[PDB]
């Protein structure tokens, strides 16, 4: 085998390596710690061993697995919490008496002891098979089957043996494929190297909605299934909250929650919360958790876990896409991943590029977003699946001028900003028209238009009203409001109602945390209508003050609509919003008078 | 204050008096099992520590 | 073998490569001294060692080495409480040593069994300006970020003395049922100041229950960087073994940064963001992984780290990473301090992420978090209204600004002004909030639900 | 009003005293515990001299100290330093040391044992060896006093717990 | 010992070092220039040679001095102008005919012309002596003795040879101490390494003030001795002026003057003015100069001497703390000092850190301020000393927010500003109440209150009045005089009288430069008594102009208290203030009616 030449920090050099690639997985030492060969300089290969290299004896053997870092795809991933190198943390709790991995851990990369339920699909002996074809299913979703079992990509043939329904373990083979002789037998799971994407027949034009369920975010710049989203975040921005919203509210069949090296206390919270939550699809047995798979890692928990976290979590989303499931992949927070590239260049001794972050950052990020999209499923039945990436980042220079935010923004299609000034007034998630776009908006608003809303027109106006508000505010601050029309006050006044009522939606309840497409339409419609009517009112006679004073209670009636649940009225439109239109028109006549 | 510069002596009598029971069981149980720990010390010393 | 060469306090040894990582090495110098070191690097018949004692006074081929055979692990006991130590775990009172009952790694967490049940039960510190506005839990990490020239250390003293006089009234309400202990780490802290922290612990009754670690910046860099990790091992051992909440006051975070910065210049590392290490993350993160509930879920380690802003900016890398890894921040503002407000806790950016995940019921209102949202939002508005008053003048201002102006003034001299040996209860702070918040009509109070609002304005 | 601040102050001076006394109190309990612990080690080392002065019971021990010492060296030639009453004992078992060393490593047996012309203290040090390489720059002080002193570091937690926990 | 391998600029590389400490002082080649071994890689050492190597050849031997870079501190330090490597500059002026040293030539650190009178302490033939115990004492000036010879730290034993009383030379030994054999011989001086601080039994929290007697200094933001203090500068816009003032009014047991790297006109000035000046305790024999020992480096003089300058001063000072002497340590300037380090860093080819200034910077600044403070000396006698470090800083790179200044304000407990306008007006120090603070105030006001003064009540009120005065003027501009009335008008007037009496001084009189603790207490007592009674009087019916004219004689007599003798009521007690209280009561009757 190999012989350890140097152990220097978490960098290990071993000499006498053979058949080693550039992201090949190796286990180092008599301990067998997770490592990966980063580089090779001559006969000596630098491996960063990223699970605690403390007490590592030098001259131990280093063993090549013969393939790069991997994930296991197949049954037991749901309602089970893992780390980013894909070893199951839950297994570790019973034996070690520890939540997170310490070291010496040599547990297999999936739980395979357990049994899962195999149902055959629509294939029979002598029938043809091709990768991504649905060979059976295992029920493990809230309502549907989760882990639909595939022929592994890059195989085709005719199936000699189809095992019937029953329970089997992962390990047990239940399928044989013959093509050019015996290709291999197949089992319930398959493996796949994480530094390679799982194949697809073809990617498709994203054109269908992704509900976030926050009013403000969907309103200004709604997401699509297969989008890419950039969010900068400075702590205390309610990151957790929006992440929680998405896992419940989104229309995606799978949510994969990804911790890219987090607090640990924050990971516990979301974890605990999911089994209490009830699914909107009439979920069972830990409703929401049944549709949830957690990648959870801790801050100084192995740098292999952090770097790999994003690749492993997207690989899991892709398996699910190939069965024809819609997935939403919430990466939280990829700024820490960016910090992991900073470290990988320095420890290795490579030179980095702009602001001490390397340039290999940029290509490596672009490859990650491209694995996402809306898709037509791998395999011959043909279905559509999705992997939709929404990724948080943060500053690193206390600006949006830093290499990290700007590179991730370069690639992205949806941009949702960060406003420290609005955050103080108690607004979360805080965005502005000037710091956000969605290139999907045009096509998305038309889609929303069909369902009932006046959505295209209202979004144009939504932008204009906030942009005009900003310019005016600079003159009021500096010069005064007393050198400026009553009318310019009106734009600010209506704009304010939108600022509290939309933006703050962090919620103190499910009623104040959820906002369907219909409800989002309704609150916007009442505010624009108020503006149009108010400018008339003052113009034919009516002071400013009198108008402000009169509308009064009505301003409040919309303010409170968020606190009340949307299951009320006819459907998801409150009787309180329905009445609110009549009250508005009745008000303009009195204000005018 | 006079009880914080002369009545803080009696608080130190009371700290002396409470340990004269400890300093004596220390020596009791150390003296008994002294011999049993030495035998472990010797096999360990003449082998790797 | 011998010392090959020496670069700053890292020493290049020529030595056989068989020793394991973190193993102690002892250099026998011709001066009579023995100095201890840790292999920072092992290489092919050579090592790079950080010396504990010294930084110089090291010979070439006359100095010799000997191996312990033992990895760097802290001898931890619970007999180390009630006694005063230096930064490397030895009494400065020169009496019986730390001793051990376990050896625990500082090179990686030992057990790492942190929180699977979110920290959610309240901890009260006797301060309204802290406890209401930023909710503290048993395992949560909220840091105090202050500026140069401020008495960061005096606010930290307040926290220590009042915490643990709350606890028996809090014990009744449910928030403790276990021993409370302080683990105090100084890096770069003045002699005078340290003597103030000992006095604080006398007042509270936890001079007997605390360990104090003193490293000065006139003690090696290598000792200084061990001092927080030594603190953590001590604090998780009490917390683990006899199921204790340990509160860690770690002053000052930039002093620790400072030392990392010198063994980066001395390493073959390139410094990343603003002259500080490109591995600055890994350092900070080692501290923050240890915090949260530890096995049995009646022991915990709760952290208040103390940061002084080296350049007085919140764009500087130190506060920015630190803030991201921790759960919130508490801000101290210079303008307050000068005015003679105490504590000078300016609540304009002070927010703590767990606010509806740090509270429950039976000791807190569920309204507690909701009330915080009014208080923070109004404070800000008020602060903006005062900014316009300064410029435009009252006559120009509208009715909304005037109310808010008024709220701001009342907030400063009543809420954030309290005594320094004066405890508060969470119930009591909220009742004080309701009166002060009562200066707006129901239209304008809308950051809390009409049910709770109708009762109390 | 201000009586309460100064009363509180003198009442703080009152528990200022209370803590220094209660700290010195446990510092006496602890330093007695060690006075006895270092009289367990006092016994150990009277035994170590008594065995060292044996020449037949001491040989299988002495050999194992040189042999173990050689595994933490792993160098082709070694110089072995001893007391002048242990040199004749090394001399009558050389073959056994190069064998036992060669057997416990992949390495082929040690070429030479050079019985050093250096001498260790006869007062302070009783038996055992300082084993060193060819150039004498790597040393394992594998004397009995040294080994007892290194065992004290790790032996101590075990003993404090069973007698005193 | 070694052979020069290479010379690359001012750095010299010498091979064949087979033992040489990494602080070891060395003389390189046959020029015999000063150098110190910065780093060692193998048998090749990196040595920075701090004087020019023009004439130095590769292939010349380098002979180790056999001890680290250390300084001897003995009797005769007083009345001598030195370098930071410590060479007597007056001596150079004699021989070479220049105050700057010739390179490749050095001279003994302490003068050897001098012989001093040694009288035995209290340890006699065969007595055990222990660290810091006073073995004898030597006169250090004609007038007074101050250099008590203690047993060196890290020694202890029985004294086998105790020389009898008489005058001896610095060269000749006097004592031999036996512990482990003859441990070594001892002299009237002892050496202590410059970066190693001298030791104590324990340090105390200072509560003791400076003996400056500068009235505003004492009352408003109380002077501490055993403190750390940062003062702004910009060079010769007041900052050098105050350092010269501080020296003059002070009458500390020792004063150590450090020019870290100054303009060299300023160093000349310090030397000449001091022996013409007079000590405010009424001592004789070149007065101020007799108590001052001068390490005076201009920035032109070698970089070794600049870096060693603060070090040499702190070790010397600390020893005087062990002798039981209260020392005032004046450093000018730390901005220059940070620069000495940055220079060395770029030459060697190591990376400096933040703002191009080194990594080692922060730990070095920090160690230096924390070294200074009030302690009880090592050894059985336990004499009390103090070291107060007042360091000057200016802008460095022209920004006063750069790392150097900002690092130091955080450590400091004391700040006293400098302003160009205030300096022109003759207010020195140029302070108000927000360009200055002291956190030492708390303990200090408590200390003074004990002595007899009503100090804490009066000091707080001083701060309040200045703060208010400023504030009422702004109102007069924006709001107008309509918000002004006579109660406010008295407030402005009391602040003016406080500025003139306290803040303004320049040493017009001898009684304007030493004013006791009791005198300072008495000035603030007049002005606060005037304030409260003027306000009462205008409320029972009086006007500002009427109050001003009426107070008159008393008002004039109390302003002029600084010119007036402080020995009028005894020796520290002034009679005029005691007679003011009664006058003020009769006066209040004249003002009201």
**C52: closest CA among C18, C77, C21, C89?**
C89
Rounded Cα gap, residues C369 and A301, in angstroms: 32
Rounded Cα gap, residues C228 and A209, in angstroms: 49
Q: How far is CA A161 from CA A152, A164, A166, A381, in A?
A: 16, 10, 15, 20
Spatial contact of E462 and E217, defined as CB atoms under 8 Å apart: no
Full 3-state SS string of E249-307: HCCCCEEEEEEEEECCHHHHHHHHHHHHCCCCCCCCCCHHHHCEEEEEEECCCCHHHHH
Rounded Cα gap, residues A301 and A373, in angstroms: 30
Tokens of A7: 């152990």
Counting one residue from chain C and one from chain E, the pairs whose CB atoms sit within 8 A come to 123
Hey, what's the torsion of the CAs at E42, E44, E48, E50, to 10 degrees? 150
Chains touching A (3+ CB pairs < 8 Å): C
Rounded Cα gap, residues E565 and B21, in angstroms: 68
Rounded Cα gap, residues E34 and E20, in angstroms: 16
Q: For residues E385-409, b (16+ Cβ closer than 10 Å) or e, as one string?
A: bbbbbbbbbbbbeeeeebbbbbbbb
Name A419's Cβ contacts closer than 8 Å, sequence gap at least 6: A427, A430, A431, A432, A435
Q: Is residue C218 less than 8 Å (CB to CB) from chain E?
A: yes
What is residue A355's three-state secondary structure? helix
Residue C423 φ/ψ, nearest 5 degrees: -80, 155
Rounded Cα gap, residues A159 and D9, in angstroms: 89
Rounded Cα gap, residues A232 and A239, in angstroms: 10
C90 appears as a binding residue in the annotation: no
Rounded Cα gap, residues C427 and C204, in angstroms: 23
Give chain D's length. 165
CB count, 10 Å around CB of C203?
21
Q: Is residue C202 less than 8 Å (CB to CB) from chain A?
A: no
A91 backbone φψ class: left, alpha, beta (φ>0; ψ -120 to 50) = alpha
Tokens of A208: 């269908």
Chain breaks in chain C (C to N over 2.5 A) after: none
Strand partners, C47: C13, C42
Rounded Cα gap, residues C78 and C25, in angstroms: 27
Rounded Cα gap, residues D72 and D80, in angstroms: 14
Contact A352 C292 (CB under 8 A): no
Residue A570 φ/ψ, nearest 5 degrees: -65, -40
Give chain E's length. 593
Strand partners, E327: E254, E387
Q: How far is CA C383 from CA A499, C346, C370, E373, in A?
A: 18, 11, 20, 42
Q: Which of D47, D64, D154 sits opposite B38 (nearest CB)?
A: D47
For chain E, the first-to-last Cα distance in angstroms comes to 94
E96 preceded by a cis bond (ω within 30 of 0): no
Residue in B closest to D58 by C-alpha: B46
Spatial contact of E164 and E152, defined as CB atoms under 8 Å apart: no
DSSP strand E in C295-419: where? 299-309, 330-331
Residue C177 φ/ψ, nearest 5 degrees: -160, 20
Tokens of E501: 């009496």
Place of tokens 């109190």: D25
Rounded Cα gap, residues A245 and D6, in angstroms: 56
Q: Which of C2, C95, C103 sits opposite D31 (nearest CB)?
A: C95
The CA-CA-CA angle for residues A358, A359, A365, to 5°, reads 105
Q: How far is CA E182 from CA A62, C318, E126, E160, E163, in A?
A: 58, 54, 14, 9, 16
**C6: closest CA among C38, C49, C53, C37?**
C49
Spatial contact of A437 and A254, defined as CB atoms under 8 Å apart: no
Contact D72 C18 (CB under 8 A): yes
Rounded Cα gap, residues E291 and E253, in angstroms: 7
Q: How far is CA E162 from CA A143, A290, E118, E264, in A?
A: 99, 90, 11, 45
Tokens of D95: 């073959």
Rounded Cα gap, residues E413 and C151, in angstroms: 9
Residue in B closest to D47 by C-alpha: B42
Spatial contact of E465 and E491, defined as CB atoms under 8 Å apart: yes
Rounded Cα gap, residues A105 and A103, in angstroms: 5
Residue from E206, E227, E410 to probe the interface with C (highest C Cβ count within 10 Å):
E410
Hey, what's the torsion of the CAs at E44, E45, E50, E53, to 10 degrees? -10
User: DSSP letter string over C260-325?
Assistant: HHHHHHTTT--B-GGGSBTTHHHHHHHHHHS-EEETTTTEEEEEEEEEEESSS-SSSHHHHHHHHH
Spatial contact of C287 and C228, defined as CB atoms under 8 Å apart: yes
Hey, what's the torsion of the CAs at B15, B20, B21, B22, to 10 degrees? 80
Spatial contact of C115 and A265, defined as CB atoms under 8 Å apart: yes
Q: Which of A265, A346, A508 sits opposite C270 (nearest CB)?
A: A346
Q: Which of D18, D68, D144 sits opposite B48 (nearest CB)?
A: D68
Q: Where are the alpha helices (DSSP H) in C119-252?
A: 128-131, 152-162, 167-173, 191-204, 221-241
How many angstroms separate the most distant Cα atoms in chain C? 84
Q: Which residues of B touch D64 (CB under 8 A)?
A: 46-47
Contact C281 A339 (CB under 8 A): yes
Name A199's Cβ contacts closer than 8 Å, sequence gap at least 6: A131, A132, A153, A154, A378
Spatial contact of A16 and A4, defined as CB atoms under 8 Å apart: no
Rounded Cα gap, residues E225 and E207, in angstroms: 8
C:411-440 residues touching chain D, CB 8 A cutoff: 421
E117 preceded by a cis bond (ω within 30 of 0): no
Hey, what's the torsion of the CAs at E557, E558, E560, E563, to 10 degrees? 120
Rounded Cα gap, residues C297 and C289, in angstroms: 17
Rounded Cα gap, residues A246 and E544, in angstroms: 72
**A292: closest CA among A279, A311, A307?**
A279
Q: Which of C105, C272, C398 sits opposite A356 (nearest CB)?
A: C272
Eight-state DSSP code of residue E188: S
Strands A254-259 and A436-438: unpaired
Residue A506 φ/ψ, nearest 5 degrees: -65, -30
DSSP strand E in C21-154: where? 23-28, 34-43, 46-51, 64-71, 73-76, 83-86, 102-105, 144-147
Rounded Cα gap, residues D72 and D141, in angstroms: 11
Rounded Cα gap, residues E394 and E239, in angstroms: 9
Contact D23 C199 (CB under 8 A): no
Please, is C80 exposed, middle or buried when counting C-beta atoms within 10 Å of its C-beta (0-12, 13-18, 19+)? buried
Spatial contact of E69 and E312, defined as CB atoms under 8 Å apart: no
Name A567's Cβ contacts closer than 8 Å, sequence gap at least 6: none
Q: How far is C430 from chain A, CA to nearest CA, in Å?
A: 18
User: DSSP letter string over E195-220?
Assistant: TSPPPEEEE-------S---HHHHHH
Counting one residue from chain B and one from chain D, the pairs whose CB atoms sit within 8 A come to 82
Name A163's Cβ contacts closer than 8 Å, sequence gap at least 6: A118, A120, A174, A175
Q: How far is E31 from chain C, CA to nearest CA, in Å?
A: 25
**A226: closest CA among A206, A243, A210, A246?**
A206
Hey, what's the torsion of the CAs at E320, E325, E328, E334, to 10 degrees? 20
Rounded Cα gap, residues C280 and C260, in angstroms: 8
Rounded Cα gap, residues C53 and A484, in angstroms: 71
Please, is B28 exposed, middle or buried when counting C-beta atoms within 10 Å of its C-beta (0-12, 13-18, 19+)? exposed
Q: Over the Cα atoms of chain C, what is R_g? A: 25
Residue from C108, C313, C355, C384 to probe the interface with A (highest A Cβ count within 10 Å):
C108
Hey, what's the torsion of the CAs at E297, E302, E306, E311, to 10 degrees? -110
Q: Which residues of E touch C155 (CB under 8 A)?
A: none
User: DSSP letter string over B1-49?
Assistant: -GGGSSSSSHHHHHHHGGGTTHHHHHHHHHHHTHHHHHHHHHHHHTS--
Place of tokens 């509180």: D8
Rounded Cα gap, residues A279 and A287, in angstroms: 5
For chain A, the first-to-last Cα distance in angstroms comes to 93
Place of tokens 């060896």: D129
Helix (H) or strand (E) holding C186: strand C180-186
Q: How far is D40 from chain B, CA to nearest CA, in Å?
A: 6
Tokens of A582: 């009549």
Spatial contact of C114 and C289, defined as CB atoms under 8 Å apart: yes
What is residue A20's three-state secondary structure? coil
User: DSSP letter string over E543-584?
Assistant: -HHHHHHHHHHHHHHHHGGGTS-S-SSSSS--HHHHHHHHHH
**E189: closest CA among E36, E110, E73?**
E73
Helix (H) or strand (E) holding A221: none
Q: Is residue B17 less than 8 Å (CB to CB) from chain D?
A: no
Chains touching D (3+ CB pairs < 8 Å): B, C
Rounded Cα gap, residues A6 and C39, in angstroms: 11
Q: Which residues of E touch C216 (CB under 8 A)?
A: 367, 370
Q: How far is A93 from chain C, CA to nearest CA, in Å?
A: 9
Give chain A's length. 593
Rounded Cα gap, residues E514 and E520, in angstroms: 10
Q: Do B and A have ≥3 inter-chain CB pairs under 8 A?
A: no
DSSP strand E in A260-356: where? 292-295, 326-332
Strands of the sheet with A166-169, listed across from one edge: A145-150, A134-139, A115-120, A166-169
Contact A59 C449 (CB under 8 A): no
Q: How far is CA E122 from CA E133, E159, E475, in A?
A: 9, 12, 70
Output the known binding site of A for ATP.
Answer: 233-240
For chain B, the first-to-last Cα distance in angstroms comes to 56
Q: Is residue D156 less than 8 Å (CB to CB) from chain C?
A: yes
Q: How far is CA E488 from CA A330, E485, E492, E498, in A?
A: 64, 6, 7, 16
Nearest-10 crossing angle of helices C317-325, C280-289: 30
A157 backbone φψ class: left, alpha, beta (φ>0; ψ -120 to 50) = left
Q: Is residue B26 less than 8 Å (CB to CB) from chain D?
A: yes
User: DSSP letter string over A263-283?
Assistant: -SHHHHHHHHHTTTS--TT--
Rounded Cα gap, residues A37 and A48, in angstroms: 7
A429 preceded by a cis bond (ω within 30 of 0): yes
Please, is D138 exposed, middle or buried when counting C-beta atoms within 10 Å of its C-beta (0-12, 13-18, 19+)? buried
Q: Is residue C278 less than 8 Å (CB to CB) from chain E?
A: no
Q: Which residues of D touch C209 (CB under 8 A)?
A: none
Eight-state DSSP code of residue C367: H
Full 3-state SS string of C231-244: HHHHHHHHHHHCCC
Helix (H) or strand (E) holding C335: helix C334-339
Strand partners, C84: C212
User: DSSP letter string over C89-105?
Assistant: S-BSS-SS----SEEEE
Name D127's Cβ contacts closer than 8 Å, sequence gap at least 6: D48, D49, D51, D52, D58, D61, D62, D83, D86, D143, D144
Percent of residues in chain C assigned helix, strand, coil, to nearest 5: 35, 20, 45
Place of tokens 């001084």: E505
**C206: closest CA among C245, C252, C151?**
C245
Residue from C118, C263, C368 to probe the interface with A (highest A Cβ count within 10 Å):
C118
């Amino acid at each position: 085998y190999g012989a350890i030449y140097s152990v220097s920090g978490p960098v290990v050099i071993a000499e006498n390596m053979i058949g080693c690639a550039m992201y090949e997985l190796v286990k180092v030492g008599h301990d067998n710690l997770v490592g990966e060969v980063i580089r090779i300089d001559g006969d000596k290969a630098t491996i960063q061993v990223y699970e605690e290299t403390a007490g590592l004896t030098v001259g131990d053997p280093v063993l090549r697995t013969g393939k790069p870092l991997s994930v296991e795809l197949g049954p037991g991933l749901m309602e089970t919490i893992y780390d980013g190198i894909q070893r199951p943390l839950k297994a570790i709790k019973e034996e070690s008496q520890s939540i997170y991995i310490p070291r010496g851990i040599d547990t297999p990369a999936l739980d395979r002891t357990i049994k899962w339920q195999f149902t055959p699909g629509k294939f029979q002996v002598g029938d043809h098979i091709s990768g991504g074809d649905i060979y059976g299913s295992v029920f493990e979703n809230s309502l549907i089957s989760s882990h639909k079992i595939l022929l592994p990509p890059r195989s085709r043939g005719t199936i000699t043996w189809i095992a019937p329904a029953g329970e089997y373990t992962l390990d047990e083979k239940i399928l044989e494929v013959e093509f050019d002789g015996k290709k291999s037998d197949f089992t319930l799971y398959h493996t796949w190297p994480v530094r390679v994407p799982r194949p697809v027949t073809e990617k498709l034009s994203a054109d269908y909605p992704l509900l976030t369920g926050q009013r403000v975010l969907d309103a200004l710049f709604p997401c699509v299934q297969g989008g890419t989203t950039c969010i900068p975040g400075a702590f205390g921005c309610g990151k957790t909250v929006i992440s929680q919203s998405l896992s419940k509210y989104s229309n995606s069949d799978a949510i994969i929650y990804v911790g890219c090296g987090e607090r640990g206390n924050e990971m516990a919270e979301v974890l605990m919360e999911f089994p209490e939550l009830y699914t909107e699809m009439s979920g069972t047995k830990e409703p929401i958790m049944k549709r949830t798979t957690l990648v959870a890692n801790t801050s100084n928990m192995p740098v292999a876990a952090r770097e790999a976290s994003i690749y492993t979590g997207i690989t899991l989303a892709e398996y699910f896409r190939d069965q024809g499931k819609n997935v939403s992949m919430i990466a939280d927070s990829s700024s820490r991943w960016a910090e992991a590239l900073r470290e990988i260049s320095g420890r290795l001794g490579e030179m980095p590029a702009d602001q001490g972050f390397p340039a290999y950052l940029g290509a490596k990020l672009a490859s990650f977003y491209e694995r996402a999209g809306k898709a037509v499923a791998l395999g011959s039945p043909d279905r559509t699946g999705s992997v939709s990436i929404v990724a948080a980042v943060s500053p690193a220079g206390g600006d949006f001028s830093d290499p990290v935010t700007t590179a991730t923004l370069g690639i992205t299609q949806v941009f949702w900003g960060l406003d420290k000034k609005l955050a103080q007034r108690k607004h979360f998630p805080s965005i502005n028209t000037s710091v956000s776009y969605s290139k999907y908006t045009n096509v998305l608003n038309k889609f929303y238009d069909s369902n009932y809303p006046e959505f295209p027109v209202l979004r144009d106006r939504m932008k204009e009203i906030l942009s005009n508000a900003e310019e005016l505010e600079q003159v009021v601050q500096l010069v005064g409001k007393s050198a400026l029309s009553d009318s310019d006050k009106i734009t600010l006044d209506v704009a304010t109602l939108i600022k509290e009522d939309f933006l703050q939606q962090n919620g103190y309840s499910t009623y104040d945390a959820f906002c369907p497409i219909w409800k989002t339409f309704d609150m916007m419609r009442a505010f624009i209508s108020y503006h149009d009517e108010a400018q008339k009112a003052v113009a034919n006679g009516a002071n400013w003050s009198k108008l402000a004073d009169s509308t009064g209670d009505v301003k409040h009636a919309v303010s409170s609509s968020k606190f009340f649940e949307p299951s009320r009225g006819e459907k998801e439109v409150h009787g309180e919003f329905e009445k609110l239109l009549s009250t508005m028109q009745e008000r303009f006549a009195e204000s005018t008078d | 204050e006079q009880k914080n510069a002369g009545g803080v002596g009696e608080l130190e009598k009371k700290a002396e008096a409470g340990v004269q029971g400890e300093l004596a069981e220390i020596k009791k149980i150390a003296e008994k099992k002294k011999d049993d720990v030495v035998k472990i010390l010797i096999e360990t010393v003449i082998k790797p520590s | 073998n011998t010392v090959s060469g020496v670069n700053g306090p890292l020493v290049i040894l020529e030595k056989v490569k068989f020793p394991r990582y973190n193993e102690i090495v002892n250099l026998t110098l011709p001066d009579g001294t023995v100095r201890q070191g840790q292999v920072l690097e092992i290489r092919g018949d050579r090592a790079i060692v950080q010396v504990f004692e010294g930084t110089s006074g090291i010979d070439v081929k006359k100095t010799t080495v000997e191996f312990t055979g033992e990895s760097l692990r802290i001898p931890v006991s619970e007999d180390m409480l009630g006694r005063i130590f230096d930064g490397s775990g030895r009494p400065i009172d020169n009496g019986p040593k730390v001793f051990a009952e376990d050896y625990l790694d500082i090179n990686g967490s030992p057990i790492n069994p942190y929180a699977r049940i979110y920290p959610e039960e309240m901890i009260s510190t006797g301060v309204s300006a802290i406890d209401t506005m930023n909710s503290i839990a048993r395992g949560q990490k909220i840091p105090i970020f202050s500026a140069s020239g401020l008495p960061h250390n005096e606010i930290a003293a307040q926290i220590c003395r009042q915490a643990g006089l709350v606890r028996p009234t809090k014990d009744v309400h449910d928030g403790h049922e276990e021993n409370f202990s302080i683990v105090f780490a100084a890096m770069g802290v003045n002699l005078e100041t340290a003597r103030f922290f000992k006095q604080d612990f006398e007042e509270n009754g936890s001079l007997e229950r605390t360990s104090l670690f003193l490293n000065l910046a006139n003690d090696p860099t290598i000792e200084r960087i061990i001092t927080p990790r030594l603190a953590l091992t001590t604090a998780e051992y009490l917390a683990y073994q006899t199921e204790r909440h340990v509160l860690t006051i770690l002053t000052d975070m930039s002093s620790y940064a400072d030392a990392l910065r010198e063994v980066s210049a001395a390493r073959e590392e390139v410094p990343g963001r603003r002259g500080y290490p490109g591995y600055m993350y890994t350092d900070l993160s080692t501290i923050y992984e240890r915090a949260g509930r530890v096995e049995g879920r009646n022991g915990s380690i709760t952290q208040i780290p103390i940061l002084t802003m080296p350049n007085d900016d919140i764009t500087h890398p130190i506060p920015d990473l630190t803030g991201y890894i921790t759960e919130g921040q508490i801000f101290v503002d210079r303008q307050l301090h000068n005015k003679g407000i105490y504590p000078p806790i300016n609540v304009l950016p002070s927010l703590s992420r767990l606010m509806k995940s740090a509270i429950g019921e039976g000791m807190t209102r569920k309204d507690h978090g909701d009330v915080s949202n009014q208080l923070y939002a109004k404070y800000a508005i008020g602060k903006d209204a005062a900014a316009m008053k300064a410029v435009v003048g009252e006559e120009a201002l509208s009715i909304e600004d005037k109310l808010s102006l008024e709220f701001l003034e009342k907030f400063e001299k009543t809420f954030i002004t309290q005594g320094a040996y004066e405890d508060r209860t969470v119930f009591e702070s909220l009742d004080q909030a309701w009166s002060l918040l009562r200066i707006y009509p129901k239209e304008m109070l809308n950051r809390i639900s009409p049910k709770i609002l109708d009762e109390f304005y | 009003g201000n009586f309460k601040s100064k009363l509180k102050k003198a009442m703080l001076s009152q528990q200022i005293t209370k803590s220094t006394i209660a700290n010195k109190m446990r510092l006496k309990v602890l330093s007695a515990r060690e006075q006895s612990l270092d009289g367990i080690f006092e016994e150990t080392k009277e035994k170590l001299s008594g065995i060292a002065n044996n020449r037949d019971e001491y040989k299988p021990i002495l050999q194992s100290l040189i042999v173990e010492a050689l595994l933490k060296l792993l160098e082709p030639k070694a110089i072995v330093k001893a007391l002048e009453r242990d040199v004749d004992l090394i001399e009558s078992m050389k073959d056994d040391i190069m064998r036992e060393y060669g057997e416990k490593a992949q390495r082929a047996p040690l070429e030479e044992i050079v019985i050093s012309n250096d001498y260790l203290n006869k007062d302070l040090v009783s038996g055992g060896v300082v084993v060193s390489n060819a150039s004498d720059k790597i040393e394992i002080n594998n004397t009995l006093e040294e080994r007892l002193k290194l065992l004290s570091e790790e032996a101590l937690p075990a003993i404090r717990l069973e007698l005193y926990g």
